[PDB]
Amino acid sequence: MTDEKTATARAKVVDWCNELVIASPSTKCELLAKVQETVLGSCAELAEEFLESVLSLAHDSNMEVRKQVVAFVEQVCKVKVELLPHVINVVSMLLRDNSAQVIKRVIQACGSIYKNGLQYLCSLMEPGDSAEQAWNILSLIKAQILDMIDNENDGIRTNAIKFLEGVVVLQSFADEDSLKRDGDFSLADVPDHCTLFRREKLQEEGNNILDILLQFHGTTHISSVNLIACTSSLCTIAKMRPIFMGAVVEAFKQLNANLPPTLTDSQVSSVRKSLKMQLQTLLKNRGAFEFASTIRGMLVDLGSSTNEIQKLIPKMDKQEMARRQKRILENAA
Amino acid sequence: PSKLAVAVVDSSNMNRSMEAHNFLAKKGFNVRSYGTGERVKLPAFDKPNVYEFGTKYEDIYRDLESKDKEFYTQNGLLHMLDRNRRIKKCPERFQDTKEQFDIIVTVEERVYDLVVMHMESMESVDNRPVHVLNVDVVNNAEDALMGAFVITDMINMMAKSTDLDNDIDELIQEFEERRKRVILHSVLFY
């Protein structure tokens, strides 16, 4: 069964796509906003035919235009993720961009793009060549952003840290102690029937990215913004994946004992206030059981009262504690 | 002047954020203001004027007018409500907004903690960072005025930057020195 809606929408976007080639960068962003709303929203069917029209604007001289293309590509992977192999090249190329503002927006978009892209690819039973190409680009995007922790721009470094946090979380296994999060995806959600990649290899990469974050967190000349961002990213990783709890608690313990001498008095107070919040959050996780006294120690150093710390510790039955108290005893031997 | 989305946050969204909102809007900034409290509290010490968030500034004006028009003219509360009703419809709560900013300015450490607690309580989706800064403003008409000039001074200096992320820590560091102030600075994510 048919109606006029699709044809009326196609006529509207054809007009908009035609104006683009002769429009000012300011007019181009207005046009693209309207094209996205229709082609990926109101009349979603029209998305594939007007792809190249939008994707060509990734080459435009105006950075705002390039940022709008990123916003579009990010929406494509949310609503029409099947188009992922046709839009993923633009993302990788835009990470080579000259403007730091464009780089930051691309890193931001890569969070959802990589999660949606990873979810889609491991869902296919008979994946084609286009699927292997898209996964190769996604692997390169991870490596690209991983290099950006040594970028000279502080904003780029902050975005890169945030991106790497999601990768570690995706490329590890959830458990009983993991925080309940609605759209949570782990290596447990990656099927054995998947030929594109191996669960063990992604885990190996996730562990290497975490090791890099742990080392980055402990450097002497890290900026206050990068240090706060890294501390919260380590907290998200440990509460989502409590297997990493011991490592993150140790990093936090080492930081509180050795504040970078590059931090200003205000930066110290800002870093310590954030560290206190992260520690409070971790103490609420059932997986922090073994580290409860260490966490308490640090919170006392950071000015928390006995009763404030005490209220954070989750209530556990003796049968649960005995399971944990014995698991901790057998792992130490 | 710049393309900076700024938010000023306080307890009630009545005195301190509105004094800064007014001056930043007049400087041409894309400014929004919020309160971190559960309800809107206006000034006995144990007897305050409490209103829900979303209650029109006009209705609060006509409520304190019918209560005591003379007393609420002498304490300058109706003068304050006149200014706010000209800026926007009603005071808004930060914890309920879906708006995203480049910079969030808090007027006291207690507000700062409420903003940071709230943003941390939410799973990040866009992975978009926001700078959260604290500028201590004492809750009284005279200090809310002086404070609004500091906040406007600070946002103007930051608006001048060609790369705020890469310059912000040095800018805060020199601003703190010149103005003999402590500006707490954190980064949160959307």
Swiss-Prot record, chain A:
Knockout mutant characteristics: RNAi-mediated knockdown results in overproliferation of testicular cystocytes undergoing transit amplification leading to increased incidence of spermatogonial tumors.
Intervals holding HEAT repeats: 6-41, 44-78, 81-123, 130-169, 201-240
Cell location: Nucleus
Coiled-coil features, chain-numbered ranges: none
Superkingdom as given in the UniProt entry: Eukaryota
Domain characteristics, as noted in the entry: The HEAT repeats have been determined based on 3D-structure analysis and are not detected by sequence-based prediction programs.
Functional description taken from the UniProt entry: Component of a protein complex required for cotranscriptional processing of 3'-ends of polyadenylated and histone pre-mRNA. Involved in germline stem cell transit amplification, differentiation and mitosis-to-meiosis transition.
Family note: Belongs to the Symplekin family.
Protein name, entry field: Symplekin
Residues of the full protein shown: 19 to 350 of 1165
